Amino acid sequence: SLAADTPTACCFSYCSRQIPQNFIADYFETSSQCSKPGVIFLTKRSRQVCADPSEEWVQKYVSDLELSACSEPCQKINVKQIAARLLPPLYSLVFIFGFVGNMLVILILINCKRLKSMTDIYLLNLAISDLFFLLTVPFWAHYAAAQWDFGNTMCQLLTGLYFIGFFSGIFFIILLTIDRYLAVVHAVFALKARTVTFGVVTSVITWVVAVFASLPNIIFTRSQKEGLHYTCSSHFPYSQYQFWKNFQTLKIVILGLVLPLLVMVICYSGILKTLLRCRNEKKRHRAVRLIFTIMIVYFLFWAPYNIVLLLNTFQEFFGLNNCSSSNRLDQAMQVTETLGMTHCCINPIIYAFVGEKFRNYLLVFFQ
Amino acid sequence: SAEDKAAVERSKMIDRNLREDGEKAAREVKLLLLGAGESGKCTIVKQMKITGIVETHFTFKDLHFKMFDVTAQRSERKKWIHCFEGVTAIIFCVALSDYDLVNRMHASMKLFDSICNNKWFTDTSIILFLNKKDLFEEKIKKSPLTICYPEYAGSNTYEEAAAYIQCQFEDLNKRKDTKEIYTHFTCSTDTKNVQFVFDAVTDVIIKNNLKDCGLF
Amino acid sequence: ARKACADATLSQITNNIDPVGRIQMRTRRTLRGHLAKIYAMHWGTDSRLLVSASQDGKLIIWDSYTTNKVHAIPLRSSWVMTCAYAPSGNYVACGGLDNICSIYNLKTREGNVRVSRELAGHTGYLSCCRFLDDNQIVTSSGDTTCALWDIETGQQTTTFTGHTGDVMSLSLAPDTRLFVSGACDASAKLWDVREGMCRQTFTGHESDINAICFFPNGNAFATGSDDATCRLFDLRADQELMTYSHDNIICGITSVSFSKSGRLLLAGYDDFNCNVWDALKADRAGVLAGHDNRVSCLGVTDDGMAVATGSWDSFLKIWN
Amino acid sequence: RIKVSKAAADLMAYCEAHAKEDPLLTPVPASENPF
């Protein structure tokens, strides 16, 4: 689920007959977005053939063709040429906005804040995660409109960086929520619990958990030539492909709308309960409004992405095997991933810039 | 460069110890005492836990509080009041019985107004304490409150006089939204008086943490 | 009479000299590590080790050449606003609101720094302090008084009184025989460590005085007030020679220090920056900026190699 | 007591005699600057 990694073709019908070897000119591996695993044989003509890797003969041909160097799959070219309509400006403006915001936050924390609190360490780590995301964003913007101009190891490292940034930002949001919970409900306990060394320890553990979750995506992703153009995507082995697919679409979902949302409704609930002790209407109303804004923004910017992922994975359930419905679902996945990019690029302005002490540091750095 | 490396490692030792001491200071709570005639806060000092500045340390409910009594400083207050910038809260003790003695209540009020409306203590709160309540009852039902306040709460009873004194003390805080004053009347049991201090300190820490994270 | 000895203003006299012109100092070393607001500092004769006072209850010796910490001393009184570094480099004096002047021995075995002596009996707080010698030491108390102490004796060798307002600062002459003291009563008074009384009193201010420094020649001294002005007085002329006051600055002054040649007079203001003026021409020469909070402490090395400026923002930096 | 003119003369003379030994006024090179 990197840049929606929309494959050129996903086909759902196999062959019941044998195809000769002389009619097999090139081989292509279907991405993980397909409902079922398959391999596409490009013949002498532009017409292509599909085969399921569960066969015994398909292995023989897919090996013989690469040792040297039926039905037609529904080409997902309209998806790209509609993506080519307005993907690039959207990706570019999101990238530049998030980049300037994250550099602002990091420079502020370095100059004015000097990392005095554990919240500062968490904010710096979240900004670094967003920066890692935004470093990969334009590289995928350049792949949406044109063929992949990089190699296998390059797109693999880029996938690694992308998923590392995503998972680390998702975990650091939870870490900031837990820090706020410990500061509001257990302030006298947080005075001895919130330490910078514990913050760095939890940040390192979060980074290693994020990279450990990303490694399944890194090893199961490669770049291959589909005709003239190149594409890098996730290709799981046909032995347990669906299973791995499920695992993939489970993990993000488990970290998309289950774990962070429960952490939020557990922590911010107690925060709002304790806010009754504030006895300041102008402050209490603003705090509840900010909490509700964070909740609703996280929902509006993450729920459609996990929903569309669940749509694309479980195709037997709510059957959408029609390739036109597949094109609509892929466009929905693209727009929802871009919505998640907007969420990650506006999380700095919603977690830091809303604070008055942060705005003071910013205006001090400005002058 | 053995000497240079030794000096750098000694600087690292000193910086590590300084960071540890700073964490210790941030963990503990620093409180301030102020009063017209007696800022020693005998009500709080009477607790069993317990030369110009008097330092009193006591841990309550897994929280250490340091209190600084400033009474031996007969010099100008504005010349050294900036040193206490950054404290948790200021505990202002006012004797309720010191309302008819002479101007003393007026001096306490002007001191409270000058301290609360100071540019160096805008964010810090004020834990106001009213001492001598049992004697205040005798004084208020034996002598009228018109001596100090022209309005004197109208009814001129203990409850009304205490309420009017509290509202008048809160009237001096021009920074209503910025600064919140926690007013309390001292009790015979020191445990309730220290529990109020703990609650006020917890509220101040809540405000500070919400300003740190960004909710406030 | 005082007005009889007046010839003219100093600017009319010095209008023939060549102006220094625009001067800009760059930050060489920035010293960090104090987890509180920094108030006072002092320089050494070797121009390598300096002292700094901060509200964190810890006083650390700064190695300005390598930007490192040499000695660290925990303080039982976190409310400190004065500190002095002895020219011999063996004793460091620390005061504050505790009314106690603690002397710390820098050179001891096994790096064990302990209080050499505790000077008590001060009715008011310690506002300023400087070292006459390793054993003779002067301090300014908060009861409008100055006290000259002996280390090994522990008694008041000399007591200077006569100020109506709270004494804030003192300055020692290069000859280490006479000194000056500035108080809140808008007065700068001369005292002798041997005679033990006020020899001359200099007035001409409207607000409190909190900064003072001798000229490198020793016959003049500038005073720092809180109404954005710095007046220069002479010991022999009994005359106010010159006054610094500008329309852009209206805030107070915290520290005043002279350079090696004395041609440049530095003063830390409350406008989050320090100002370097020309000694004679009475015009501004430089604006040192870069401190987040108000510049509290200002010091110049005895040889005038560089200038240390420290603010309430836990930041003290070296300019040259 | 002396005149304010003689005092200013002594001050400016001490300044001009010591103007050479002024690291603030005279920008010293990096080889001559410990800082």
Residue numbers in the entry:
A (entry chain R): 1 to 69, 112 to 409
B (entry chain A): 6 to 55, 182 to 233, 241 to 354
C (entry chain B): 21 to 340
D (entry chain C): 27 to 61
What do the authors report?
The chemokine receptor CCR5 plays a vital role in immune surveillance and inflammation. CCR5 exerts its physiological functions by binding to multiple chemokines, such as macrophage inflammatory protein (MIP-1α, also known as CCL3) and RANTES (regulated on activation normal T cell expressed and secreted, also known as CCL5). Here we report three cryo-electron microscopy structures of Gi1 protein-coupled CCR5 in a ligand-free state and in complex with the chemokine MIP-1α or RANTES, as well as the crystal structure of MIP-1α-bound CCR5.
To facilitate the formation of the CCR5–chemokine complexes and improve complex stability, in addition to the mutation and truncation, the chemokine C terminus and the N terminus of CCR5 were connected by a 12 × Gly-Ser linker, which resulted in high protein yield and homogeneity. Additionally, a disulfide bridge between the receptor and chemokine [T16C (CCR5)-T15C (MIP-1α), E172C (CCR5)-F28C (RANTES)] was introduced to further facilitate structure determination (see Supplementary Note for disulfide design). Using the optimized CCR5–chemokine proteins, the cryo-EM structures of MIP-1α–CCR5–Gi1 and RANTES–CCR5–Gi1 were determined with an overall resolution of 2.9 and 3.0 Å, respectively. In the structures of MIP-1α–CCR5–Gi1 and RANTES–CCR5–Gi1, the N termini of the chemokines adopt a ‘hook’-like conformation, which is stabilized by a salt bridge between the only negatively charged residue in this region (D5 in MIP-1α, D6 in RANTES) and the positively charged main-chain nitrogen of residue S1. Additionally, in both chemokine–CCR5–Gi1 complexes the side chain of the N-terminal residue S1 forms a hydrogen bond with the receptor residue Y2516.51 and the main chain of the third residue in the chemokines makes a hydrogen bond with E2837.39. In contrast, the MIP-1α residues A4–T6 approach helix VII due to a spatial hindrance caused by helix II, with their conformation stabilized by interacting with D2767.32, M2797.35, Q2807.36, and E2837.39. For instance, the MIP-1α residue E29 forms a salt bridge with R168 in the CCR5 ECL2, while the counterpart in RANTES, Y29, disrupts the ionic interaction with the receptor. Similarly, residue Q33 in MIP-1α makes a hydrogen bond with residue K1915.35 at the extracellular end of helix V, which repels the positively charged K33 in RANTES. Induced by the interaction with the N-terminal residue S1 of the chemokines, the side chain of Y2516.51 shifts downwards in the chemokine-bound active structures relative to that in the inactive structure of CCR5–maraviroc. This movement results in a rotamer conformational change of W2486.48, which is known as the ‘toggle switch’ of class A GPCRs39, subsequently leading to the outward rearrangement of helix VI on the intracellular side to accommodate the G protein.
